[PDB]
Design a protein around this ligand. Structure first.
Ligand code: RBF
Ligand code: RBF
Ligand code: RBF
Ligand code: RBF
Ligand code: RBF
Ligand code: RBF
Ligand code: RBF
Ligand code: RBF
Ligand code: RBF
Ligand code: RBF
Ligand code: RBF
Ligand code: RBF
Ligand code: CL
Ligand code: CL
Ligand code: CL
Ligand code: CL
Ligand code: CL
Ligand code: CL
Ligand code: CL
Ligand code: CL
Ligand code: MG
Ligand code: MG
Ligand code: MG
Ligand code: MG
Ligand code: MG
Ligand code: MG
Ligand code: MG
Ligand code: MG
Ligand code: MG
Ligand code: MG
Ligand code: MG
Ligand code: MG
Ligand code: MG
Ligand code: MG
Ligand code: MG
Ligand code: MG
Ligand code: MG
Ligand code: MG
Ligand code: MG
Ligand code: MG
Ligand code: MG
Ligand code: MG
Ligand code: MG
Ligand code: MG
Ligand code: NA
Ligand code: NA
Ligand code: NA
Ligand code: NA
Lengths: 67, 67, 67, 67, 67, 67, 67, 67, 67, 67, 67, 67
């Protein structure tokens, strides 16, 4: 059984780096992370000093573990 | 990093009040709730005494916290 | 078996009241109405005296009855 | 020919009132506003004092005018 | 308030049995599971000995409990 | 001209059998049923003794008949 | 209250003429037909002598009447 | 950079002619119109003397110009 | 087993004629073409002398043949 | 690099068996088939002696091979 | 009230840089740009010397200003 | 007439580079490649040594050629 958590990563550099930010957080807290699907991308502009790219991903992990 | 939980709030009054019900529950259990996106709305009819409006929301919260 | 009819309710007050308008009509003509799913919302402006909120719902009813 | 502008209205009261906020702004600046279609709804939470409901609408107006 | 978890069940027999696999896991760990909505289906081929059917479901459970 | 009715079939066995349940009901009441398109699948859990698989289909029938 | 029926019109000439075919059938059997929304278009090839264009429309009619 | 305007053209003849109506209006008011994407089609029935076909298009134009 | 190829037909006359253009090409190269589903429509403007209507279709053909 | 072919399998038994039919055909003609994603399901009724379940899948295969 | 403009940015380097191109143009002409949502990505190949990445974004800006 | 092939490119560097990987393969085997539309993005994690970014694109090429 796989379970997915919906995380939005952020980066001041790129959409790829924002996806990595989310995946990094998932790997810090969950075992057996296996893949991530991008579901949305955007850019925060007014409210931050530098534009901040955001990439929302469903990050899937295999259970027999970490729900 | 933001994380989202998918909650369906209910209200016997309105769709707005059903969205608030879900957000209220999120704030009872999570720190740093920042926004909610409506993803579905419906009405429970047969099975309840009074029609019950339901609003499903993705409620986003900022981590460095509450996963 | 459930069957659904696609109805657009109207109200000069709110989207919730427009959903109720459609459900009310379904209950006037069908037995065993069990739930409604919102599929669209809009507002009629030019053509009416007062803005008219509209909510389109799939209204589900249980058969062994009313097709 | 109709043209649409994509506006997000806000309200501290309800989703219907947030749709009205957007339509009100359209009527302040455009002639012949004829209808609005809801395309998204959400709630701003962290960043405001009171939750702020938002309703995004495509507001249509008839040209021979106001592009 | 209902909450949903996004689980992908697997089965070497059928899509229905893969949906049951996910629901079974949800019932092992959560109280008040009430329904599941299918959101995707697929088949793992290269990487397994036997084709493995997968069915992804949003499994809903009623809170006053198990978040 | 074809017309479609939106029916949700149920089965305690499988998604295929739930699609058949809906089609069976359509054939009991309509002439010239020609095809069905699956539009949603789900499982009722809490509220029934046994899980009940549901498959929602648009069932198309040719008119010159049965509207 | 408006109600919609989902009809697929056919024509050996064009997609517009296939939409008209469906609307024509609706007007033969229902009062107060007010608009139609196109939801799908296709072409039947193998099975007919001449290609047959099909246009599926939700045809809306105002009730106080014809459900 | 390209920018798009969302226009609904109308025609008493066909969906293609309604798309042309919208594009014609865009070319009357904007420089460098390069393409149009159809996003919706429908037919106005009750409210007009003759059925009026409508085609909604995103019409794209290249800037260094006409925003 | 049916297989589909995704083709975009073009025409300087209409969307129906652009769908036919794609189907014509499929029939020139494939046996047992059975139907086509429209998936997108658009108009090429800047880059051509005359507007060129385009209709993208999934064209289905029955195998035991032409993959 | 992976490539996908869009195939509709058929079965007089079930949706799972119809997905297998498509995958079987892909494996007869392509090397390195790795997974399949279900994209549509339906049932052929009028035109066949027995209802025929159909499952449309994108079947993915790894290249360095079989385009 | 927020308003959105639909812009397609281009870059010969990356999808992130193409999103920035669109946002840059919005900031040159509009006050209070607050965020951008990615809605499509693509690559122009035949017609340019170097592949050109394109990212289409809805760029939102707060009014009390720049419609 | 344009035809599209659905390819998933991979890269250990970025989503843009994964789109290029797919396009590169298309240009190795097809004449007149004209554009690519991104349809999905994801990241392979468990199963590879280094995260592998994937970008799925519909790559369009003009026929009078390479089907
Ligand atoms: C992709 C994306 C979408 C956003 N959507 C909204 C929105 O709908 N409403 C809003 O108030 N802020 C939105 N924001 C936040 C906005 O930029 C700003 O931070 C907030 O409005 C501050 O209250 C969004 C930001 C991003 C990056
Ligand atoms: C928005 C909404 C959607 C629903 N969809 C379904 C459904 O698909 N099948 C079902 O059995 N009950 C559904 N129900 C529940 C139905 O009203 C009733 O409570 C159950 O059928 C009781 O087993 C739904 C309720 C709501 C509010
Ligand atoms: C949600 C919504 C969508 C509408 N869409 C259209 C449309 O696409 N074309 C149209 O002519 N009228 C449309 N109308 C009706 C419009 O407001 C006006 O009543 C008619 O144009 C009168 O012929 C719409 C009304 C609502 C409430
Ligand atoms: C419907 C909605 C969607 C939003 N989406 C985002 C988002 O994707 N990213 C974000 O940073 N802020 C988003 N925000 C804004 C968030 O609440 C907060 O104001 C900003 O994050 C402040 O920079 C959204 C707000 C609303 C109301
Ligand atoms: C429904 C489904 C979708 C998949 N999608 C992908 C994909 O996009 N990329 C991928 O590398 N593997 C995908 N896989 C996994 C693939 O079969 C194989 O296990 C992995 O590629 C091994 O790294 C998918 C498997 C299934 C069942
Ligand atoms: C596919 C599916 C979707 C459902 N969605 C809802 C829902 O949104 N809200 C709800 O109250 N019940 C829903 N139900 C019904 C739920 O299981 C239970 O019967 C009712 O909540 C009883 O009032 C659904 C059932 C099924 C099978
Ligand atoms: C838009 C469109 C979609 C169709 N889809 C299917 C399908 O999914 N399966 C099928 O067997 N026939 C389909 N057909 C019918 C096909 O052309 C042929 O008549 C039947 O396969 C005969 O049993 C479709 C026809 C049209 C016009
Ligand atoms: C494609 C299309 C969609 C429409 N949708 C609506 C609608 O949702 N509600 C409505 O009141 N009128 C709608 N109308 C307008 C309707 O035909 C009539 O002009 C208005 O209802 C008059 O107030 C629509 C018209 C078209 C052509
Ligand atoms: C439906 C449609 C969509 C198009 N989309 C794009 C696009 O996204 N980017 C682009 O550069 N050209 C696009 N074009 C092509 C544009 O008209 C022009 O030929 C090219 O920009 C020339 O490099 C499109 C053309 C059509 C007909
Ligand atoms: C899922 C599915 C969808 C279909 N859609 C259509 C359609 O849109 N138009 C049609 O003529 N036949 C359609 N058919 C075929 C229909 O059943 C019958 O075989 C043909 O109409 C014979 O010309 C479909 C069949 C299936 C299984
Ligand atoms: C994302 C994207 C989508 C496009 N879609 C189309 C299309 O549908 N039809 C077309 O003629 N050109 C399209 N083009 C343009 C194509 O590459 C070429 O510039 C034009 O065909 C030249 O007339 C597209 C370009 C991009 C980048
Ligand atoms: C975008 C993406 C989606 C995937 N989806 C699935 C899936 O649904 N099921 C699965 O078993 N593997 C999936 N995989 C593959 C997974 O990472 C792993 O390689 C396989 O599970 C090995 O059998 C996916 C990989 C990617 C990159
Ligand atoms: Cl989710
Ligand atoms: Cl409300
Ligand atoms: Cl429907
Ligand atoms: Cl036409
Ligand atoms: Cl495809
Ligand atoms: Cl099954
Ligand atoms: Cl728009
Ligand atoms: Cl990137
Ligand atoms: Mg930096
Ligand atoms: Mg988002
Ligand atoms: Mg009350
Ligand atoms: Mg729902
Ligand atoms: Mg009043
Ligand atoms: Mg509508
Ligand atoms: Mg107040
Ligand atoms: Mg939004
Ligand atoms: Mg076995
Ligand atoms: Mg999936
Ligand atoms: Mg049993
Ligand atoms: Mg459903
Ligand atoms: Mg003829
Ligand atoms: Mg169809
Ligand atoms: Mg005329
Ligand atoms: Mg429309
Ligand atoms: Mg000509
Ligand atoms: Mg297209
Ligand atoms: Mg049998
Ligand atoms: Mg299909
Ligand atoms: Mg360079
Ligand atoms: Mg695009
Ligand atoms: Mg590296
Ligand atoms: Mg994918
Ligand atoms: Na989730
Ligand atoms: Na219907
Ligand atoms: Na394809
Ligand atoms: Na717009």
């Amino acid at each position: 059984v796989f379970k997915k958590v919906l995380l939005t990563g952020t980066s001041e550099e790129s959409f790829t780096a924002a996806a990595d930010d989310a995946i990094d957080r998932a790997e810090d807290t969950l075992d057996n992370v296996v893949w991530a699907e991008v579901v949305d991308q955007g850019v925060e502009i007014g409210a931050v000093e530098e534009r901040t790219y955001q990439t929302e991903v469903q990050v899937a992990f295999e259970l027999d573990g970490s729900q």
